[PDB]
Amino acid sequence: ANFLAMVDNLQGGYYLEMLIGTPPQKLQILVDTGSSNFAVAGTPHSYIDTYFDTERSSTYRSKGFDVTVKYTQGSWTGFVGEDLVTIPKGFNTSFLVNIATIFESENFFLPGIKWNGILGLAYATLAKPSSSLETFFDSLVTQANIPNVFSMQMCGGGSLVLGGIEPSLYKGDIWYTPIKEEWYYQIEILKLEIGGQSLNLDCREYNADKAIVDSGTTLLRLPQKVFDAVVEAVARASLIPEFSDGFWTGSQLACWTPWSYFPKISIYLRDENSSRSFRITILPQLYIQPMYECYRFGISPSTNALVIGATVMEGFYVIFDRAQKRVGFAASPCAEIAGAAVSEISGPFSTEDVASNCVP
Amino acid sequence: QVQLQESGGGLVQPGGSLRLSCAASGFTFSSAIMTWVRQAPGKGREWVSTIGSDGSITTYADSVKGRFTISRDNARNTLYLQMNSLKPEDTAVYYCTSAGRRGPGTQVTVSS
Ligand SMILES: CN1C(=O)C[C@@](C)(c2cccc(NC(=O)c3ccc(OCC(F)(F)F)cn3)c2)N=C1N
């Protein structure tokens, strides 16, 4: 690989241009660290330009079985095949991968999205129909001779660096937190802090369902109890009363013709040395999201997981280091509005007052 | 299971040849992309060859193109690599791999 060629390979969610088959067909593919399937539109469908026509690729081969994926707000079904893929911005060769071509979907291609397939970059264990459907990144690692690492920067284009870390995409040090389970990119959250004030929740509350780093989720999603605790704390810490209940639950916009008023939100993560922790911090600019200028709240409740989505990933260079079973973080120099950093990272802080494992 | 087991290696002279096998189990072999890779001590891992599940699509590293042929027998759950015109730089543990799993590998030495 050539990592310097990978800088600025993302557009838009955030998507990568990929060429599938012979002759190549160009698709726009969402980068999703929260699933494990390479799946693309296989038929015309409302709210997409393009789709992969398997009949037009001379190298395509059908596996002769289908796959159905169900998530919480929807689903898709596709034929499973294999074909040759090129990534024009990164590698000069093509690779043989598994592919799912979607021929029906329930609530999956929604209006206004600009991708037409998904690239799941998580672990084999999440792959469907099963974990023996070799994931896109497992293929690339083996065939492209690259390290078992990738890293992401989103500038809210962006960068997906397959097979390493690009030094020009960060300043300061990278902080590494252990991967706790290799399915999603599950990490250990030790504490949430608002305006400098810690919530008073048992740290198990933060990992209760599970805390994961997911680029295929837009918002910071928090378990109900944790979400209530945050909203109360942001309300409590903002200079003037600005927000209706409607704003907090995404059901209303907040408008001005307004930023010193709202607090920073910090997430504490266990270092590789479990006695130490580091903090990733977002400023109101990242969670008070521009849509008179109106804004939507960047955080929403979750039943199933604590999801470190784009709201947070936008501030950091995130390094998914599968080879050493850790997820790394550094501040993104691109994450700046009107001259100011919209995120920070600091450490170390002692974990001596926290349970030595916060995951139930 | 995925369980993979390579065999067929040995000590061979320059210009010689070997036929490697990889016996698979614990997954549907006739459904899986299969890959050979190699690593020699003190060197990075090097991709050798990949084959699609039906066997009709094959790709090769430039360093082996023309001298090695990958193939498979789905009914026998076996992957093969026919190695010809072997040279000293082909020395390595050859591993077969699928879905992020690998077998323990087989030793190939090419020498006088
Ligand atoms: C959360 N999630 C799922 O529920 C299932 C799956 C397949 C999925 C399915 C359908 C859509 C999506 N995600 C998106 O469409 C999306 C859109 C924008 C996103 O970020 C854009 C921005 F950060 F705000 F700029 C991220 N994801 C993910 N992947 C996931 N990670």
Q: A226 and A85 share a domain?
A: no
**Measured between alpha carbons, how far is residue A120 from residues A37, A50, A130, A306, B91 in Å?**
5, 20, 14, 19, 35
Q: A253 and A121 share a domain?
A: no
Q: A190 and A290 share a domain?
A: yes
DSSP at A164: S
Strand order in the sheet with A276-282: A197-198, A189-194, A265-270, A276-282, A343-350
Instruction: Please compute Rg for chain B using Cα positions.
Output: 13
What total number of domains does chain A contain?
Answer: 2
Residues A190-215 as b or e (16 or more Cβ within 10 Å = b): bbbbbeeeebebebebbbbbbbbbbb
Strand extents, DSSP E, A165-285: 175-178, 181-182, 185-186, 189-194, 197-198, 211-213, 220-223, 254-256, 265-270, 276-282
d(CA B8, CA B78): 12
Q: CB-side exposure of A330: number of CA atoms within 13 Å?
A: 19
Could you write out the DSSP letters of every residue in A31-65? EETT---EEEE-S--TT-S----GGG-SS-EEEEE
Which atom number of ligand 1 is nearest to the Cα of residue A73? 4
Write the single-letter amino acid at B10: G
Ligand 1 touching residue A156 (CB < 6 A): yes
What is the number of CB-based contacts under 8 A between chain A and chain B? 60
Q: A124 and A135 share a domain?
A: yes
Contact A335, A345 (CB under 8 A): no
Residue of A142, A143, A146, A325 to mutate when probing chain B, most B C-beta within 10 A: A142
Last residue of a domain, one of A146, A161, A193: A146
What distance in Å separates residue B1's CA from the closest CA in chain A? 10
| Residue of A75, A118, A128 to mutate, ligand 1, most atoms within 8 A of C-beta | A118
Other CB atoms within a 10 A radius of the CB of residue A340 amount to: 10
CATH class of B1-112: mainly beta
In sequence order, the 6+-apart residues with CB closer than 8 A to the CB of B29 are: B74, B77
Pull the structure tokens for residue A204.
Answer: 């198990």
Q: A127 and A247 share a domain?
A: no
| Domain presence at residue A43 | yes
Write the single-letter amino acid at A197: Q
Domain ranges of chain B: 1-112
Question: Which of B28, B35, B56 faces A143 most closely, judged by CB atoms?
Answer: B35
**Which one, of A122, A289, A306, A291, lies nearest residue A220 by Cα?**
A306
d(CA A246, CA A263): 19
d(CA A152, CA A276): 25
Q: A212 and A295 share a domain?
A: yes
Last residue of a domain, one of A125, A146, A167: A146
> Which domain covers residue A105, as residue numbers?
14-146
Q: CB-side exposure of A225: number of CA atoms within 13 Å?
A: 13
Contact A10, A158 (CB under 8 A): yes
Pick the residue whose CA is nearest to atom 17 on ligand 1: A13
d(CA A318, CA A33): 11
d(CA A285, CA A304): 26
Report CA dihedral (A229, A230, A235, A236) to the nearest 10 degrees: 60
Q: Which residue of A has its CA nearest to B55?
A: A61
Q: A186 and A103 share a domain?
A: no
Q: Which residue of B has its CA nearest to A123?
A: B100
Pull the structure tokens for residue A273.
Answer: 């040395």
Q: Is A49 a catalytic residue?
A: no
Q: Is A32 a catalytic residue?
A: yes
Stated length of chain B: 112
* Pairing between β-strand A336-337 and β-strand A340-341 as defined by DSSP bridges: antiparallel
* Pairing between β-strand A94-106 and β-strand A38-41 as defined by DSSP bridges: parallel
d(CA A249, CA A219): 12
Q: What are phi and psi of A244, to 5 degrees?
A: -70, 165
Centroid of ligand 1 to alpha carbon of B21 (angstroms): 42
What CATH number is given to the structural domain containing A66?
2.40.70.10
Residue of A134, A139, A140 to mutate when probing chain B, most B C-beta within 10 A: A134
DSSP at A312: H
Peptide bond into A348 cis (omega under 30): yes
Are the beta carbons of B50 and A82 separated by less than 8 Å? Answer: no
According to the entry, how was the structure determined?
A: X-ray
| Domain presence at residue A7 | no
Centroid of ligand 1 to alpha carbon of A31 (angstroms): 8
Q: A194 and A119 share a domain?
A: no
Chain A residues touching residue B99 (CB < 8 angstroms): 124, 127, 131-135, 138
Contact A283, A200 (CB under 8 A): no
Beta bridge partners of A331: A316
Contact A79, A89 (CB under 8 A): no
Q: How far apart are the first and last CA of chain A?
A: 40
Strand extents, DSSP E, chain B: 3-7, 10-12, 18-25, 34-39, 46-51, 58-60, 68-73, 78-83, 92-98, 101-102, 106-110
Helix (H, G, I), strand (E, B) or coil at A126: helix
Q: What are phi and psi of A359, to 5 degrees?
A: -90, 125
Last residue of a domain, one of A90, A118, A146: A146
d(CA A160, CA A30): 11
Report CA dihedral (A36, A38, A39, A40) to the nearest 10 degrees: 150
Q: A290 and A323 share a domain?
A: yes
Q: A229 and A348 share a domain?
A: yes
Beta bridge partners of A269: A189, A278
| Domain presence at residue A231 | yes
Pull the structure tokens for residue B106.
Answer: 């087989």
Ligand 1 touching residue A116 (CB < 6 A): no
Ligand 1 touching residue A35 (CB < 6 A): yes
Instruction: Please compute Rg for chain A using Cα positions.
Output: 21
What distance in Å separates residue A322's CA from the closest CA in chain B? 12
What distance in Å separates residue B66's CA from the closest CA in chain A? 18
Q: A168 and A248 share a domain?
A: yes
Chain centroid to Cα A301, Å, comes to: 17
Q: Which of A83, A138, A214, A321 is catalytic?
A: A214
